[PDB]
Paper text:
The transient receptor potential vanilloid 4 (TRPV4) channel is a polymodal receptor that is activated by warm temperature, osmolarity changes, and many ligands. Like other members in the TRPV family, TRPV4 is critically involved in a plethora of physiological processes like temperature sensation, osmoregulation, and mechanotransduction. In summary, we have identified the cytosol-facing cavity in the S1 to S4 bundle as a hot spot for GSK101 and Agonist-1 binding in TRPV4.
We first observed that mTRPV4apo is a homotetramer, where the S1 to S4 bundle and pore domain composed of S5 and S6 are organized in a domain-swapped manner. The selectivity filter of mouse TRPV4 adopts an open conformation in the apo state, which is distinct from those in TRPV1 or TRPV2. Moreover, though the subunit in both xTRPV4 and mTRPV4 is domain-swapped, the pore domain in xTRPV4 locates much closer to the S1 to S4 bundle as compared to those in mTRPV4 (subunits in green and tan, respectively).
Author numbering:
A (entry chain A): 304 to 638, 649 to 786
B (entry chain B): 553 to 638, 649 to 786
The structure:
Amino acid sequence: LTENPHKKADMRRQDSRGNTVLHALVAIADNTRENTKFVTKMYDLLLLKCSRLFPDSNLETVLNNDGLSPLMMAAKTGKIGVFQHIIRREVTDEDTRHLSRKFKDWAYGPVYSSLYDLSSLDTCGEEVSVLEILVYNSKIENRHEMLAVEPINELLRDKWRKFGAVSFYINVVSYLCAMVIFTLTAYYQPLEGTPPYPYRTTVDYLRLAGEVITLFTGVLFFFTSIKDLFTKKCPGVNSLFVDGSFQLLYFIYSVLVVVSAALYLAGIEAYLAVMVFALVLGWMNALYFTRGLKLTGTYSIMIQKILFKDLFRFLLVYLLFMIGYASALVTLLNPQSNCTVPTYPACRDSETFSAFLLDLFKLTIGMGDLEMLSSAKYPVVFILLLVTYIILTFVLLLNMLIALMGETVGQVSKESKHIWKLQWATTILDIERSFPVFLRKAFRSGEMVTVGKSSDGTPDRRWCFRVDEVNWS
Amino acid sequence: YFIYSVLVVVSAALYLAGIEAYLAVMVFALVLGWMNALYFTRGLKLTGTYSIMIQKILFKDLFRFLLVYLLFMIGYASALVTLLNPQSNCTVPTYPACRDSETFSAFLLDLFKLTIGMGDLEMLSSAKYPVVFILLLVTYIILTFVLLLNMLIALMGETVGQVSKESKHIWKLQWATTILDIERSFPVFLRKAFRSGEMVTVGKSSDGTPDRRWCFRVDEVNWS
């Protein structure tokens, strides 16, 4: 069909969706052996033939309707085999060599400085990159394995060692200082609100400085949040972190600080109670930090699961069980003042509000001891029921929780450090996205023209990343 | 060992002086002394792995973990004392709030710290501002208990799956260090060395020591 003497079938032609031969050839691929083998082979065949027929342009650049590319499409759909091959492709014959990725720079015996061309793994935000799609997008299926292909891992390492790690510590220490100052300014708040204008003495000036710096940090965080919200890469592929993860925490924090500032100007009693509330949420944010280096505590994953996972419904059913027992036993025990804060301890069905006696019995059982021995007072059915309650509660809770411990410890495997690596990559990339990347802080460049010229991404300079290796072959 | 000796010597000096409140390092010396006993028991009989833990926990993730825990709890203490801040009451600390009595932050801070550490005794009272305080404190206690237990037990699992043959490798390294510093302590070249062997010709060579070539014979059995 490529060289039929009759009407030709130009490879560059694309369907209604825009998926040309390579987009579709990636759409059918999988992560198996035979499928990846033949898809990679035929991808190479098609690309080389199309380049030979039209050396003017590279076939792989023809975007679909969504604007992606075969490499980007394999990244977004989660195709490890095609992605690995297309990111480690080198072609020998010169007429079709310009469409390679893993150039060779120099060798000095057993040392090879392999120059991977990341012309399209990072665009400084100009056009969507394979790293952003790969890591920010949480709907990928093979996110880790693809994030460790070869140029990606070393690229993240290099970013870490260059405005990736220093800036992270700077930001974490700055946020910790902001939280400390928030704590101090709330604690040293003028007694019972009463927001005066007394800033004349040294300690008062210090308090004013703390308040103003706290407000400045809050407004800066809100500015960051709104900038992130407005900045959308593509409909469907975007952070969309509202009501998810932890961006909502920063948003809520800023909202609370602003509301508190308003009511502080008003100076109203029982309304600064959100100030302190802000603070608690503030320090919960510190828990979502410590996701960088040094094998950080895995709290995140647990709090990321326990928030909306089996433990939630488990504690819900536990509350239902205990409250059902509370109703059962208060009904059983329901049948002069006694000088007690709750109305009566039963006393021939005194009753009042269910919550009162319910909480009485709830705290009694939670504390556990103090017994109820008395004398006679109806048969042993009550003590029998309560002893089954305590025995089943203690035994089942301990056994199930400890078996869950075993399950999670056998489940917190290399998958856990995969989460750590993903968090580290997200930290690096949102650090870069925060400040202008295209400044003179990017990834290394390479050859200018001819041997290292091609129309794959960026001018003939072909911004390339060199990774060293040693092979005894 | 250096610190132990320094403390003993300083204490001997002040004992000659005989000054009050200065022999407190004597007892201090003793505590450190017995901590040295922990670094012993690194020889035979599958000694307790205390060392590795104390060798890690001293300057590893647990240190910063407890540091951030202290920061979290103290932040909560400041939050809740600020919330609760608003006749003598005969109490060792000045007042339990009592309309913003205040004095020194450490006083009320330690009051609330020990109250939370002990945990019980509640604070029920009546009315006294809305449920936001009790809500916050119940979140504190729930997250504290649940997260600490779950993370500590998961760390237990991680270390037990990590205390592998690598652990007995540490044991063997400690055993080797014990043997070698024992030898280095006293003159080794005395008649306590490792066996000798052939003298000349077949067992002569200029690799180390005279043609005697101090050699170590290891027996083996091979059915070949």
